[PDB]
Design an enzyme around this catalytic site. Sequence first.
Site: not given
Lengths: 411, 407
Positions: B106, B278, B283, B109
């Site tokens: 991720c 969000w 992506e 973070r």
Amino acid sequence: RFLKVKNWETDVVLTDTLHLKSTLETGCTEHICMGSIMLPVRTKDQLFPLAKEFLDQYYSSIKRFGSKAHMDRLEEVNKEIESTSTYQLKDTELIYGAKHAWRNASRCVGRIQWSKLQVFDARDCTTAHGMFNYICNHVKYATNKGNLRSAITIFPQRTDGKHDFRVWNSQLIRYAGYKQPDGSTLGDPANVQFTEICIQQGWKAPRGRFDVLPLLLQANGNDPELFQIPPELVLEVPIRHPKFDWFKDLGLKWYGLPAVSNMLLEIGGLEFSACPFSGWYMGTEIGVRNYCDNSRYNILEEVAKKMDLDMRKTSSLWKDQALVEINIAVLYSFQSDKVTIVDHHSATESFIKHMENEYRCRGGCPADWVWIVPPMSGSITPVFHQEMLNYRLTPSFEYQPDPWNTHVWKG
Amino acid sequence: RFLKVKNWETDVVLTDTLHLKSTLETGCTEHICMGSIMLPTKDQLFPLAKEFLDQYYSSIKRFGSKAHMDRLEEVNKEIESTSTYQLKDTELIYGAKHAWRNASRCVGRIQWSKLQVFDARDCTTAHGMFNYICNHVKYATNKGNLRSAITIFPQRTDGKHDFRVWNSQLIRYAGYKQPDGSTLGDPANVQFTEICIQQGWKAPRGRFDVLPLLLQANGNDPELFQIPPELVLEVPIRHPKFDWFKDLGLKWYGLPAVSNMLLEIGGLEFSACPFSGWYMGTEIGVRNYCDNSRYNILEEVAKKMDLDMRKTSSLWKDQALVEINIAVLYSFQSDKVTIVDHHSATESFIKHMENEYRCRGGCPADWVWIVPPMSGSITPVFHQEMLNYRLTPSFEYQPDPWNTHVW
Ligand code: HEM
Ligand code: HEM
Ligand SMILES: Cc1cc(N)nc(CCc2cncc(N3CCN(C)CC3)c2)c1
Ligand SMILES: Cc1cc(N)nc(CCc2cncc(N3CCN(C)CC3)c2)c1
Ligand SMILES: C[C@H](O)[C@H](O)[C@H]1CNc2nc(N)[nH]c(=O)c2N1
Ligand SMILES: C[C@H](O)[C@H](O)[C@H]1CNc2nc(N)[nH]c(=O)c2N1
Ligand SMILES: [Zn+2]
């Protein structure tokens, strides 16, 4: 054991059996992956099993495993090792070795070409002047007026580690970098340390932005000597853009021949510490890394200004836009000048085919995803969606420390 | 045993002391790295509980305190008795935040400590799950000013009473295999869409049909529910320069909400724990729009730009890719829906990484996932060495329910 890899775009699954022939370590363990880490005088004791491992592979490849010729060669090498503490490779074995070191290079996307490598045997070389001559010949041959040809030149193997042959340059052709008193850098920042050495060794620096570095060549463990590659052998490409006419006025060029000269070539336990090798460029090496890395020429800003992109916010992707245009210009320029180059879409597509072929005919193809995926537009290339297994096979190309850190000076 | 990571752009070196507290396995061995592979009892339970309680009580500066020992004792008694144990609200929140903190894939973070945790352990039915999920969606969406959240449903008992959200994300678009042989909508969701149909969904066979929720409570059969359309915030995609871009008919939803993972805390397993943050712009524009096995719109866009699509070396793909991602960010920002570009996000991750090394001794990270799918080397993460290892609490992958469901 069987290991499966999946391509997440095509669902194609492949099965690796080659990893069972893996030897050396990865750096990883069951508790830590070191996948993104850049970098994680031998006894006869360790030497003959490595020799034998290699010769078994060579003789299988030529379909002569278990033959008298195979058995004689083993016997012959065993004795040379116990007599002289090392051994000499036949020309055939050397050529096989060098081709396979490239075939095994898990970080190289260009490996579809591995079987077409011109091997220059420089094991009879004894002096830096001799090295200079061999390297000039390699450069001329490999350049071939822009129709680039892969080649490797192989200088005498290590003996006691006190008589090493080394090319001190990280690449045969590279531009100087000069640190200015104001902290700015003239030329290639990557090469500041090496440029300083060259100057210290007697090199008269032109102090321009694109000065081709001299060769710093070390034979038989003696102090290195400086040589200038004849400028007529150094093919360069002025960089321009097919639509933007201001681009030429940036004053950029690059050399045609990428030639790594600081790696060690291991074959059957023998160590070749001077083994310059060359292919041709993938466009992103120049246009993405060499021009746009913050730690290199770093031209995104200037290019972006001239394009009048919105540079106030990163979310305008002005950096991304300028990066593409620059990579367009690099490819355009080389193609326009008929100098061999390959775009990242072409080279990754070829690699996937190479890889699948290697699974079928070899049982695997070790690959470092971290290095294989191109530094721009990663997921629109087929390697991004491809699972890979990274492992070490011999023969191989290895990193070695920089010579100025280990060299015992003669004076 | 103490490990160094170097940033090759800045020369900053960091020393990892934290990997020595990793227990789970990487898939890698001394002989083979699997860094690019996508998917590498009471006696078991108490040391896992202890490990967790120890780190929890350490965090609140009460290690080796009476309350620590008391809790350890209490949990021990409870496992001995009940064969499991229940987390205190404080431990649940701590554990969920740390599951995120430990998510090595991720990039976002830096936000880990600011996570709204919704305790849904009192849920008993799929209708109850639907209610909790609508509340999550509404809270997290927040009219476009997105807020990270997780909703945690009851923990696994005997593996026959599992709570599961059958969807991979709370909000996604359907996919239909056509008689034309092509694919309408999102190709990624064909299999799930069919299961929805086999289970009763009336599909509006469109290109951007928001999928229904398929909810499994207490190991029981899964039920369908439709998210109130007014809670699903979507964004029409336009380009700030290309007038024609809107004609593509492209839109995307504002809320990325992963719903198929397993939250492990103190040995306890939460099989239903949908979480949301969000989007990072790539992506949507790189993966969702330009992946070949997704919406795969690169060609249409390139044609409208009238690019030379004869040779790959014109980098027409690369050009369209940039524009598409420009439009995504532009559309979201114009509609005030929270989004982050890959430059800002990776820049934040480097600072987070430096904070973590300095205040925790490390930060496990998967370079293959952290580096964005475009323009990789012009983001600082590309030049950053990362060590990947598994810490608990964690989010884990788990099998799709329908391979495992005893209907
Ligand atoms: C024929 C054209 C070739 C192309 C297009 C090509 C492409 C590449 C690229 C893009 C890289 C990654 C380096 C970077 O991007 O920073 C690489 C690495 C590498 N290549 Fe190739 N290559 C070619 C030929 C060769 C040849 C002839 C050899 C050796 C005989 C070779 C051996 C290697 C090795 C050992 C590495 C790893 C370098 C390292 O570990 O730093 N390549 N190649
Ligand atoms: C708030 C802003 C957030 C951003 C910008 C963000 C960004 C990302 C990105 C880009 C990925 C790569 C996954 C992919 O490309 O499919 C990822 C993975 C992941 N994220 Fe975050 N995320 C955010 C919030 C969260 C939250 C709140 C959680 C949990 C509480 C979380 C947990 C995870 C996990 C477990 C993965 C790995 C998923 C997998 O392995 O498939 N993220 N994130
Ligand atoms: C033969 C060859 C062809 C090609 N297209 N690229 C390469 C890699 C170019 C390259 C550039 N900068 C750095 C490295 N490595 C070389 C090994 N060196 C020790 C570290 C850096 C390699 C090699
Ligand atoms: C909270 C969150 C925010 C964000 N910006 N991205 C994500 C990941 C998006 C995403 C997309 N596709 C797939 C996955 N994972 C989900 C878990 N699934 C089992 C594997 C694939 C995740 C999550
Ligand atoms: C830290 C990270 O491994 C490092 O930046 C790597 C990433 N991938 C790379 N890939 C290539 N081809 N060349 C590189 O120098 C690097 N550098
Ligand atoms: C094969 C490879 O591991 C796979 O394509 C990965 C690569 N890196 C990724 N990184 C992110 N963030 N998301 C992904 O889906 C993937 N896919
Ligand atoms: Zn690994």
